[PDB]
Design a binder for these strands. Structure first.
Ligand SMILES: Cc1ncnc2c1c(I)cn2[C@@H]1O[C@H](COP(=O)(O)OP(=O)(O)OP(=O)(O)O)[C@@H](O)[C@@H]1F
Ligand SMILES: [Mg+2]
Ligand SMILES: [Mg+2]
Ligand SMILES: [Mg+2]
Lengths: 929, 73, 132, 117
RNA sequence: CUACGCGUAGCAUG
RNA sequence: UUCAUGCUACGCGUAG
């Protein structure tokens, strides 16, 4: 056709470029670019059809195809005059892709074209969408982006698990090759925002109008004002691009001299801690027109939402500053002449520079409170201890406290032979039988403790999307409104297990009983008020756990020091004992599975969901790879109860105490301190509850992403269309908490995505018609949000979907379920994996519980946990409970025989007649008690 | 089974080796737990028995530890 | 009668705890070789009987198609039991001999091993071999 | 009985703090305290610049050639001379029996110990 | 006779 | 050899 070859000539124009007609000679329907729009038809960040573009493609010398396209928009002349009016006022800025405006007779009409110059194949929103709505099968746009910008060759993608972060952590390097591309795009955004400020034009800046070279193009939705007074609305832009700024590490070039990637690293002054001036310099370079007040040090913050806001920027900005700057801040104080060096500060990567304020220079005496604060401090231990260069980990070591490195080995399990003989005599473990020992005590070598410490390399700096996090923190706190929390005084703290180890260095002198009994209540209250005014850093003696597993991986327990537990208990135990005693909520920590409790759990999840399926998931490396932002977000949600008992600076120093004692912390892994890049200590007070708030945050973020991933044109319902529209309003356009809409979205997710969370493992009961349309979260939305926020890949294998409600959760808390009958009522019974129960019987951690006849209450508790197997259709499973029943029979037989052979016959025999009778084990699941 | 009692035999074998202070040699104990943790994660029988042969030989290299002359009867 | 019940059961618990703690080593080794004789594998009973009459390996028995295995041979009747020519029947796989080192650490050849040289040989024999 | 337990743990904490103050250097540490423009110094730079000695735990021979080569190596912009090399069994390893050939015979990891020169 | 708190032990879950 | 939850088993205090 002459028309297409003449149009291909005219779009070239002044700038000479050989072109190939990508698409067809008319306007080209694109293959699903992602957009960020808000107008009166749709709202959200979804994939749409760009139908008005006429995309071309440049040809260089010797006819190669380049990453340089001419997006040619056909739009109306009433927009075209406005387009040229704005572009003639942004023409000198180098962050505007050129535009080449004309009109041309496609059908004899002089239809106006916007024949833009040298845009990439994709826009920033395609990159943000592909890395953010990541689907393991459908990721062709992410592959084209990583290939065309030399981040990895195309044969990188034939690798097994190329996309995963847990396996193949070279994908972090592959993504980081986009880091200068993203940073150059941020500089172009600031050039564009400066130029559109100085031209005085007003409009929202969306990701989709920015290519990968940086150059902004689209000049509709702009209104002209007086020059010097214009403002660009970059809340949706920077908010939606925030997970990519640490996924691709766009500020590693800021850690070079002159910020040039060829030049060496900045030799920072190794004593310089207070990077506040450079933090403000970074924020004025990159996030310039981000019009909410950023505080570098988060001590200057105005409420919890401002702490999340400013800590989100410090997570990005602290990847530049050297890791020998963070951690505690020590000052050589003097006590009665002899010079201590204790920590009077902390430079958090997130909460800025936090100085103490009850710092005592020239102390004369030290009370017990001050000795705990000074001994729990890593200051002495890293000052007196000698330097360590640990090449075993990538995690930054600091010191070493012994003259040699201690190696920790996990023993094998003391194999109970008597139960295994009784299991093969009663006919188990035959050929091809479906109940075989899959659970063992897997023994470990010497370097297992440090090789399991090193799984904090899965953790990363994660800059969360801050408008999503500042809305889902309100929806998560709407899930926690049924509880009552607050500070309790030292006499109100209930400690259940006093005889547990109190962390380093306090386990060199006794158990936690020693410190709760040595301190008076006034000392504990004064220590808690010290932490109300001062950050104290602590040590977690990260030891190995010796437990049954079905995998050979060692399990570590991060036993925090008692200055963290005895203050986190006073700060948090009212909310924790309220979550552990509120039945029928979303969070089911504390709800017993017995006594018909599992059935009431399941009928609470099933609360009036319209087309109810089920869905579970599991977080790959939840404790190791949880971001810093989501753990401080969970500490804030657990600290939103302190609206009366605390001030606001009290809440910040108690947040910074929790962050310096749990999140980013000096951790002792075998006689040598390391810094921990984040995650959760499992010896934390709020380790099942902040995990639970993290879990609700991932679920609500999956629902927010899923409701904005849908078209909105393609939703036949209009209530959820006008709930999507106010979701994008309350997310990226309103600052404060729109509490009517937070109540509506909470009522929406209690209707259609009803949930159940005992801390890491979750069962929802989602309205499957809406998730077929996308109006709640499927598994693909959890996979995408786990990828861009939690920085792991959650496979489709470890996530299930039980279609019929009547078979219940496939697994919740590693308990399968069934639907069986007692007393003319179909109740739900939770049954474990049968290999787990036989492995617990056959393998004992001590030798004293092998033939010392302590086994009675052991196998009684295993049979209480293994009663619902007897209602299973598989008789092979159902024989497990009778195996334990006859084994308790044989145990009581040999017990009475040996007690007759020793002294005399037993008389109180009817106390044990209930033990080998299933009256005792059925009554543990009848809901009357 | 054969699988079940070779797994339980590897468990009690490494308990015997850890009783005889093979923890003190880091390389020999790393080999012992590699053999043991490959027994217990085994779905085949013959490769479990050949690694059992290897691990029991690591026991039998210690001459003065277990008096095998009097213990077989 | 009532109080003495809990007294005698706590003393019985302490007695059975110390009873299992005391013979923690010898009973575990008898129990190990009990279930080894219960396994009845020919490779396992091969290794147990060779370590019975003295033929004891000096390292780990390998799994590679070719790797090194050091093993003590005490005398010559065991050598007739395990060596037929240039082979070494051991752990139910054929081991190809490559050198023999005697007690004073000299390389001893296969050809001089017979009845007449056996009182002149410095026993034991530290041989080494490769898997077939 | 409780106050005696309180007294013994006060005495033990005071003892370990006073021993670990007389263990830390007071010349390089006082130099970097007085070098600090506000007297406040990050904790994870205190042992990097005022260490009495360095411990490098080396997992394999490749990281041994890359870091602790020879008898004197450089880490943390300072010259460290290898005072000792100890293997994972807490046994001495002299520098001559660490090679590419002997690396399958060493009980890895190796805990080298180096004083500051 | 019954339930509720306390202490110890044990088991399971996260 | 941690934190939090639930349930057993074993001895106490309170009330009906
Ligand atoms: C405080 C605490 N004290 C002791 N144990 C803890 C915790 C916490 I918080 C988690 N756990 C452990 O979690 C295991 C199952 O989860 P699991 O081992 O599979 O975690 P994971 O490795 O990240 O999951 P992947 O296998 O997919 O990688 C299970 O023993 C145990 F619950
Ligand atoms: Mg595990
Ligand atoms: Mg998983
Ligand atoms: Mg797993």
């Amino acid at each position: 056709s002459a028309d297409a070859q003449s149009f291909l000539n005219r779009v070239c124009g002044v700038s000479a470029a050989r072109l190939t007609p990508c698409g067809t000679g008319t306007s080209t329907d694109v293959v699903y670019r992602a957009f960020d729009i808000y107008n009166d038809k749709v709202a959200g960040f979804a994939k749409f059809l760009k139908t008005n573009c006429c995309r071309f493609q440049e040809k260089d010398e010797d006819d190669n195809l380049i990453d340089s396209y001419f997006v040619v928009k056909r739009h109306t002349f009433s927009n075209y005059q406005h387009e040229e009016t704005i572009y003639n006022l942004l023409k000198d800025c180098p962050a505007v892709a050129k535009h080449d405006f004309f009109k041309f007779r496609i059908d004899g009409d002089m239809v106006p074209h916007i024949s833009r110059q040298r845009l990439t194949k994709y826009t920033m929103a395609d990159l943000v969408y592909a890395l953010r709505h990541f689907d393991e099968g459908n990721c062709d746009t992410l592959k084209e982006i990583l290939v065309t910008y030399n981040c990895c060759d195309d044969d990188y993608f034939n690798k097994k698990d190329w996309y995963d972060f847990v396996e193949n952590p070279d994908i972090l390097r592959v993504y980081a090759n986009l880091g200068e591309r993203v940073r150059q795009a941020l500089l172009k955004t600031v050039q564009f925002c400066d130029a559109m400020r100085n031209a005085g034009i007003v409009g929202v800046l969306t990701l989709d109008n920015q290519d990968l070279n940086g150059n902004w193009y689209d000049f509709g939705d702009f209104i002209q004002t007086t020059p010097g007074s214009g403002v660009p609305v970059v809340d949706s832009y920077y908010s939606l691009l925030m997970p990519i700024l640490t996924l691709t590490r766009a500020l590693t070039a800021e850690s070079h001299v002159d910020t040039d990637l060829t030049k060496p690293y900045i030799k920072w002054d190794l004593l310089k801690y207070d990077f506040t001036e450079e933090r403000l310099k970074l924020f004025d370079r990159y996030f310039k027109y981000w019009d909410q007040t950023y505080h570098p040090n988060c001590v200057n913050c105005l409420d919890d939402r401002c702490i999340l806001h400013c800590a989100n920027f410090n997570v990005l900005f602290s990847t530049v500053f050297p890791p020998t700057s963070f951690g505690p801040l020590v000052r050589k104080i003097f006590v009665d002449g002899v010079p201590f060096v204790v920590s009077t500060g902390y430079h958090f990567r997130e909460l800025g520079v936090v100085h103490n304020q009850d710092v005592n220079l020239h102390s004369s005496r030290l009370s017990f409170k001050e000795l705990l604060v000074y001994a729990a401090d890593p200051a002495m231990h890293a000052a007196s201890g000698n330097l360590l260069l640990d090449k075993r980990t990538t995690c930054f070591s600091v010191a070493a406290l012994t003259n040699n490195v201690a190696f920790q080995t996990v023993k094998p399990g003391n194999f109970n032979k008597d139960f295994y003989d009784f299991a093969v005599s009663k006919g188990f473990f035959k050929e091809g039988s479906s109940v075989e020992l899959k659970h063992f005590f897997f023994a470990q070598d010497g370097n297992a403790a440090i090789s399991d410490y090193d799984y904090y390399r899965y953790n990363l700096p994660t800059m969360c999307d801050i408008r999503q996090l500042l809305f889902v923190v309100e929806v998560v706190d709407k899930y926690f409104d049924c509880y009552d929390g607050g500070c309790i005084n030292a006499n109100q703290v209930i400690v259940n297990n006093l005889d547990k180890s109190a962390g380093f260095p306090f386990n060199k002198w006794g158990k936690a009983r020693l410190y709760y009994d040595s301190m008076s209540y006034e000392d504990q209250d004064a220590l808690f008020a010290y932490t109300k005014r001062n950050v104290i850093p602590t040590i977690t003696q990260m030891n190995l756990k010796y437990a049954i597993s079905a995998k050979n991986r060692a399990r570590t327990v991060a036993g925090v020091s008692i200055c963290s537990t005895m203050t986190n208990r006073q700060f948090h135990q009212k909310l924790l004992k309220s979550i552990a005693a509120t039945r029928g909520a979303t969070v089911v920590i504390g709800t017993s599975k017995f006594y018909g409790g599992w059935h009431n759990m399941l009928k609470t999840v099933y609360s009036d969901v319209e087309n109810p399926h089920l869905m579970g998931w599991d977080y790959p490396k939840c404790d190791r790879a949880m971001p810093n932002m989501l753990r401080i977000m969970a500490s804030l949600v657990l600290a939103r109860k302190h609206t009366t008992c605390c001030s606001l600076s009290h809440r910040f120093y108690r947040l910074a105490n929790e962050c310096a004692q749990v999140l980013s912390e000096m951790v002792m892994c075998g006689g040598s301190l390391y810094v921990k890049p984040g995650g959760t200590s499992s010896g934390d007070a709020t380790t099942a509850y902040a995990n639970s708030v993290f879990n609700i945050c991932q679920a609500v973020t999956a629902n927010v992403n899923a409701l904005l991933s849908t078209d909105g044109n393609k939703i036949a319902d209009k209530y959820v269309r006008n709930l999507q529209h106010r979701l994008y309003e309350c997310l990226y356009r309103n600052r404060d908490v729109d509490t009517d809409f937070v109540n509506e979205f909470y009522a929406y997710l209690r209707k259609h995505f009803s949930m159940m969370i005992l801390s890491d493992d979750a069962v929802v009961c989602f309205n499957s018609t809406y998730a077929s349309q996308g109006l709640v979260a499927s598994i693909k939305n959890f996979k995408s949000v786990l990828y861009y926020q939690n920085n792991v890949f959650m496979s489709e294998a470890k996530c299930w979907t039980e279609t019929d409600l009547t078979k219940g959760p496939h697994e919740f808390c590693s308990q399968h379920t069934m639907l069986v009958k007692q007393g003319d009522d179909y109740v739900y019974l939770p049954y474990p994996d049968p290999s787990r129960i036989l492995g617990a019987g056959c393998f004992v951690d001590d030798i004293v519980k092998t033939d010392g006849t302590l086994m009675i209450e052991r196998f009684v508790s295993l049979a209480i946990d293994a009663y619902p197997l007897t209602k299973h259709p598989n008789q092979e499973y159902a024989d497990v409970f009778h195996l334990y029943l006859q084994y308790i029979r044989k145990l009581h037989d040999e017990l009475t025989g040996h007690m007759l052979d020793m002294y005399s016959v037993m008389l109180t025999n009817d106390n044990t007649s209930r033990y080998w009778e299933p009256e005792f084990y059925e009554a543990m699941y009848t809901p009357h008690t | 089974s054969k699988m079940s009692d070779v797994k339980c035999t590897s468990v009690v074998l490494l308990s015997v080796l850890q009783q005889l202070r093979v923890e003190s040699s880091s390389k020999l104990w790393a080999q012992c737990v590699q053999l043991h943790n490959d027994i217990l994660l085994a779905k085949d029988t013959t490769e479990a028995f050949e690694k059992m042969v290897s691990l029991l030989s690591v026991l039998l290299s210690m001459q003065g530890a277990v008096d095998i002359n009097k213990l077989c009867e | 009668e009532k109080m003495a019940d809990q007294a005698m059961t706590q003393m019985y618990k302490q007695a059975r705890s110390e009873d299992k703690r005391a013979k923690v080593t010898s009973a575990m080794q008898t129990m190990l070789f009990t279930m080894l004789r219960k396994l009845d594998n020919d490779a396992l009973n091969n290794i147990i009987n060779n370590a019975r009459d003295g033929c004891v390996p000096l390292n780990i028995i390998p799994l590679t198609t070719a790797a090194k295995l050091m093993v003590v041979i005490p005398d010559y009747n065991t050598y007739k039991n395990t060596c037929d020519g240039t082979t070494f029947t051991y752990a139910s796989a054929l081991w190809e001999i490559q050198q023999v080192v005697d007690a004073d650490s000299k390389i001893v050849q296969l050809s001089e091993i017979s009845m007449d040289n056996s009182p002149n040989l410095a026993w034991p024999l530290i041989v080494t071999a490769l898997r077939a």
